């Protein structure tokens, strides 16, 4: 029914991507979306569906689509499989076990990695608690190391929570950069709002 096209490219070929802990989340509504653009594209290296059809997805309609966007290293590209542990899903981006959506990733050494090092991409390295599903951590406090109190990161046992990614181009693929788009769909007892092309 709905007639206006959903812009994915504002996320997918976005000139600049987010950093991990402050992952970019662009909600989609009142439009239509041809997901064929992705599951035929060769540009993507890793691409997973979770509980959703790759194809009859675009037969389907939703209440809205959430497309998430950020950039991680290589050996943690898999850390956004559901119910997983490691510095990423524990701390700065977590999908729940009961996940329904799509994960897409591809090399960005071509773009996001320059000589010297694109240390401007950071992840979260410390946090007292675990991360909730879709919880966004942009807290910068002292990470109290469990022995002594602290105000300001003065000295030891108080760590600046974050850490840069050294992206040198010569660095290997596990320590290369990887843009990541975490698609996601939801429904509700509320009108259909985002459709696919073949959605009658």
């Amino acid at each position: 029914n709905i007639t206006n096209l959903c812009p994915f490219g504002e996320v997918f070929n976005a000139t600049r991507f987010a950093s991990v802990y402050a992952w970019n989340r662009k909600r989609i509504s009142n439009c239509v979306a041809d997901y064929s653009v992705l599951y035929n594209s060769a540009s993507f290296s890793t691409f997973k569906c979770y509980g959703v059809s790759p194809t009859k997805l675009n037969d389907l309609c939703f209440t809205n689509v959430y497309a998430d966007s950020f950039v991680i290293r290589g050996d943690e590209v898999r850390q956004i499989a559901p119910g997983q542990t490691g510095k990423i899903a524990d701390y700065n981006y977590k999908l729940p076990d009961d996940f329904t959506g799509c994960v897409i990733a591809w090399n960005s050494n071509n773009l996001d990695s320059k000589v010297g090092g694109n240390y401007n991409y950071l992840y979260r390295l410390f946090r007292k608690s675990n991360l909730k599903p879709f919880e966004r951590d942009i807290s910068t406090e002292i990470y109290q190391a469990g022995s002594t109190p602290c105000n300001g990161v003065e000295g030891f046992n108080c760590y600046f929570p974050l850490q840069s990614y050294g992206f040198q181009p010569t660095n290997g693929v596990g320590y290369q950069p990887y843009r990541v788009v975490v698609l996601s769909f939801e429904l509700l007892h509320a009108p259909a709002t985002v459709c696919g092309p073949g959605s009658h």
């Epitope: 190391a145 469990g146 022995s147 003065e154 000295g155 030891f156 046992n157 760590y159 850490q163 840069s164 050294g166």
Partner: antibody, heavy 120, light 108 residues
């Protein structure tokens, strides 16, 4: 070539004092801060104390909080641990240690060692 | 203050063995752990950081794992050039105390 030699290793009667002098070379002494680590003769390694990148912050071990003190000279590129009311427990060889980056410790660069023997 | 309990106490293994040393933690110290191989009489020589990455120049038969209070030291094939006392240390907290230390033997 990160060279770290040290001296002051010798003799002292308990309750009397001495200090060790770790001389740096082949690396930016300012790059990051140092630790002293103490090895009893043929025993485990015992961490002693740390001093910072900018000579401002120091942690010590609870054995040495009260009678030991750590310091460094960023100009002549040397570290020094002064040890005041020594106990025979303190008999050991000592090592100065670089805090190699580790993005958080991991001492890769050690001094040869120098022995404090506390016999009168 | 945290102590590292590293076991076994000693080890009289032989050539080619795949023997393993372990390290228990007083708290959750997630990866900031280090192993050092002390060729005796000399100063400790580094082995591992993150408990799971080499340092170049160190031979590959070594490794470890663990993400918590319990970690491993994997040595696949022993040569007489592994004869040392192997130590444990947590980089996570300061003081960076150590383990008791574990010695290794050889000889079929």
């Amino acid at each position: 070539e990160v060279q770290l030699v040290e001296s002051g290793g010798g003799v002292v009667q308990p309750g009397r004092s001495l200090r060790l002098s770790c001389a740096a070379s082949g690396f930016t002494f300012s790059s990051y801060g140092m630790h002293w680590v103490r090895q009893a003769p043929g025993k485990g390694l015992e961490w002693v104390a740390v001093i910072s990148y900018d000579g401002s912050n120091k942690y010590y071990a609870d054995s040495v909080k009260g009678r030991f003190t750590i310091s460094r000279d960023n100009s002549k590129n040397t570290l020094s641990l002064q040890m005041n009311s020594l106990r025979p427990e303190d008999t050991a060889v000592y090592y100065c240690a670089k805090d190699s980056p580790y993005y958080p410790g991991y001492f890769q660069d050690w001094g040869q060692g120098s022995l404090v023997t506390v016999s009168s | 203050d945290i102590q590292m309990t590293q076991s076994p106490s000693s080890l009289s293994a032989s050539i080619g063995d795949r023997v393993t040393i372990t390290c228990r933690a007083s708290q959750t110290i997630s990866d900031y752990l280090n192993w050092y191989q002390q060729k005796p009489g000399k100063a400790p020589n580094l082995l591992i950081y993150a408990a799971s990455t080499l340092q170049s120049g160190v031979p590959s038969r070594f490794s470890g794992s663990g993400s918590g209070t319990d970690f491993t030291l994997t040595i696949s094939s022993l040569q007489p050039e592994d004869f040392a006392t192997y130590y444990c240390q947590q980089s996570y907290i300061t003081p960076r105390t150590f383990g008791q230390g574990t010695k290794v033997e050889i000889k079929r």
